[PDB]
Design a protein around this ligand. Sequence first.
Ligand SMILES: Nc1ncnc2c1ncn2[C@@H]1O[C@H](COP(=O)(O)OP(=O)(O)OP(=O)(O)O)[C@@H](O)[C@H]1O
Ligand SMILES: Nc1ncnc2c1ncn2[C@@H]1O[C@H](COP(=O)(O)OP(=O)(O)OP(=O)(O)O)[C@@H](O)[C@H]1O
Ligand SMILES: [Mg+2]
Ligand SMILES: [Mg+2]
Ligand SMILES: [Mg+2]
Lengths: 500, 494
Amino acid sequence: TVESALTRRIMGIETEYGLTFVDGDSKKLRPDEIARRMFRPIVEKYSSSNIFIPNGSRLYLNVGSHPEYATAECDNLTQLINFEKAGDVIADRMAVDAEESLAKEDIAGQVYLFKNNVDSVGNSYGCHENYLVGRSMPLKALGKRLMPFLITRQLICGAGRIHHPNPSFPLGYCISQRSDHVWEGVSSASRPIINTRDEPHADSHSYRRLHVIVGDANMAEPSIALKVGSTLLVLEMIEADFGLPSLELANDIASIREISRDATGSTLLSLKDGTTMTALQIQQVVFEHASKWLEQRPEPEFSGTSNTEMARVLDLWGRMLKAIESGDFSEVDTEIDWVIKKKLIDRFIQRGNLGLDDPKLAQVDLTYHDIRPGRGLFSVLQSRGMIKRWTTDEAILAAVDTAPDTTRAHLRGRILKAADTLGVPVTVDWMRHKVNRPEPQSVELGDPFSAVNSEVDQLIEYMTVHAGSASGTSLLDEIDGLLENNAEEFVRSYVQKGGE
Amino acid sequence: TVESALTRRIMGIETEYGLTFVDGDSKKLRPDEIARRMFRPIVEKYSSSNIFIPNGSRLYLNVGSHPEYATAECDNLTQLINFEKAGDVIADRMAVDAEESLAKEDIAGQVYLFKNNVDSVGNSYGCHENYLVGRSMPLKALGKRLMPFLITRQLICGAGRIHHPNPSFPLGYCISQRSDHVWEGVSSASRPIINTRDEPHADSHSYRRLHVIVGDANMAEPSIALKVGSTLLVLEMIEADFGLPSLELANDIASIREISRDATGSTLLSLKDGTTMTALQIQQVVFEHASKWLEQRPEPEFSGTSNTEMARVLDLWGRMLKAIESGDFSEVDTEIDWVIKKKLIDRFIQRGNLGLDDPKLAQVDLTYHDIRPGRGLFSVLQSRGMIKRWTTDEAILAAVDTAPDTTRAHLRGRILKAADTLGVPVTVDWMRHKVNRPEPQSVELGDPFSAVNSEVDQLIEYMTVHASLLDEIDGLLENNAEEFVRSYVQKGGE
Ligand SMILES: Nc1ncnc2c1ncn2[C@@H]1O[C@H](COP(=O)(O)OP(=O)(O)OP(=O)(O)O)[C@@H](O)[C@H]1O
Ligand SMILES: Nc1ncnc2c1ncn2[C@@H]1O[C@H](COP(=O)(O)OP(=O)(O)OP(=O)(O)O)[C@@H](O)[C@H]1O
Ligand SMILES: [Mg+2]
Ligand SMILES: [Mg+2]
Ligand SMILES: [Mg+2]
């Protein structure tokens, strides 16, 4: 049943940003302090650190003290990438505003926001992936098919990091930031790699939400595209009963760190059946079946991820696997984050004959993730053209302002925008949107896919309706405030030459 | 021939901005100076004051020293409005940048950009409309049909002005800024109200460009929509040979000033036939026929201006004509600029029992046109919600960055953007686009309507093909790396 596969699927990304405030040679502020500084306008306006912005994404201050951006629901991959990048734009704006406000205060520093998973001590913050799935779908299958792919997935989509041991694993370049910590998390008693149990944010009967913590945060758009897209393909294959060999492993986290250490992909995993496979082999099988699936795969009637796009995903996936087996990364050194980072690091090492333990390298490892244009290394690389682009800048810029038209987020956006224009208080959630005053009116959006709801239309109408003398009064006063007090001189002074 | 009418038509807008730099109680800078300052970043990059921006619009410094923004070719009315509005954003950005740069210099002032047609002295700068037309289309017909409409059009779409006599005409609110000056232009020995002779910027055999100088610059989107849309409907009716009556005027500019003075539309125009009609009557006839035409008018197969939108325009037009007849403007006071302006002025007068000669009122007259958000009167009014919107903010914001997808402009945009990323020099015009180096390659786009050209793709391909780092990065990085890394510490979330 090829039709069963969800070609049009709701997906979202949760991004936790590393945050610091530094004068040269020191940190001016505590992370919690600078975080509070950044959210200061938001808290002033809405009286909450946690809010939903007009594009439909959720922006909030984490328990970890991290600024967190959760994308609006997206049914298309390029779309998802656009909004994830949009988060970077918004967050950076917030950072700059914090800098200026502190500067007025005589406090001098630069804000650094990192889209990365680790710190010098070895604490970890993650990028989280959310995929809509049918209620019917079983856990066992997920463990049988999805999990081996996810464990090995770090080879193709990894961001990379340098690992420094404290007085086990030696010093080396690692393809994945998250692997060690995910392992720590599962081993210590305790967060799952995969969870289908948490609230769907969709109608309970129809759907579940699949939560993935394994992935790295990615700077390069192709890396994101590969990471999410491959997962989508695997999910599609599982749904369609396309068949995939069951690769279930005796222990999921057994080889994960080791895989992280080995670029070759030669690491050996023990399957439940008692067979043994290299990680690269696992990737190879999944990829091959995906390749057949694409030919099998029917185009979505509405929206979704096009077969062309999936072809692109498979192209990159293939080139990357090819690179790992071959050992020649020249084809992909623009697309994949760990490869890119490694290339640059290699440049520094060669120029200085530097050791891996060299601080400059660690600095590069961190700053690559810095999201400020013209400061962060990734940005520099993009300016040179060393980085490949999946999507245009302008689409991202559109994404910061407006909600995805295809998904439910669109509706949310409308309300928010209307509210902001009207000046009426509103309370919004993924599923639930309501108008607080004068009389509370609540609409629940069960369907993530639907971009059209009648009740929402009535809600906005209500808001507009409730939206004489006081208005004009305040207005006249405001205009007086705006206008220069000596009017006569202002108008007299204005002089111009005739044009054309 | 209803099919013959051009439902999808290329339209451009030429906007000249009033510019001044003022400290309180004085003008800090000469307009040429502040203009040069605003355009200084552009000149450094491109070595030219005149350039084409990625959205496909032309941005340049006028001989008058006015910054001028000319919209990219648009085949849709709302589209046109979007890009025109986008021009305000771009221009204001340039202005603020200038303010900051002067501020660093110890020179303190505020930049003002006015989208209006006049100054206190009485010099005039215009908003110009460009409409694509067939070469076949006769001038004579335009004189008989289009011109009477244009003269009277100021009533419906006018921006408004206060007129002050110099020690002729008395003091009063005027619906239109441009009328007196246009009258001076035709009367004095000589710029025409409409010209089809200037270069089409399209294939000469197929098309001509019609240029209209009569209009006011408009702040409110519905006002723009009404002006351009009404003009479009008239053009469509003429093209279709719908049979709109010819009301030819003995002298085009004879009553125009007078028309500007009278809100009732009771001003009487002498026709060539010797019949006499009031301006309101002219507008009424044209409007009624346009209304019939919409019933007749076929939907454009691709793009263009939809019949629904034209219905919107006619609704506004009808409400305006009725308001003028009745004297009750309550219905349209959100939509039309001169009505809005008059309303605000009325509030001020009511509050202060002010005379019309009062400077504050003139100040309101000028500042209403100021394009800076939150300082502009129009901006304030809109924020309160007192102003009607034809288009969304977001569409405008998109328009600032990217070219119209439907028209030729799109192609141009594709080229420019590419160059900017690639860093290859390019030379661009409305029709003509070329790559200067290594070997010059030129593509000429004859068709304004076409958004797809293979030659353009080849050009971009060429650019792509033909198209230090460590030092830069070292510059960016904090010099003490170990301390920088050591310092970074975070708590794990979730
Ligand atoms: N129906 C759905 N299917 C799949 N993903 C969804 C759906 N609805 C929302 N999402 C995605 O789920 C993510 C929600 O993460 P969010 O941070 O809001 O919740 P959470 O962190 O799981 O909850 P908490 O705040 O309690 O930790 C968003 O990225 C959103 O795009
Ligand atoms: N084929 C066309 N049909 C109608 N209008 C067009 C066409 N091509 C371009 N336009 C519009 O004509 C306007 C041209 O403005 P521009 O400033 O270039 O004037 P110009 O004719 O070059 O005169 P000048 O150089 O003196 O300003 C633009 O707004 C553009 O949108
Ligand atoms: Mg979350
Ligand atoms: Mg011009
Ligand atoms: Mg001109």
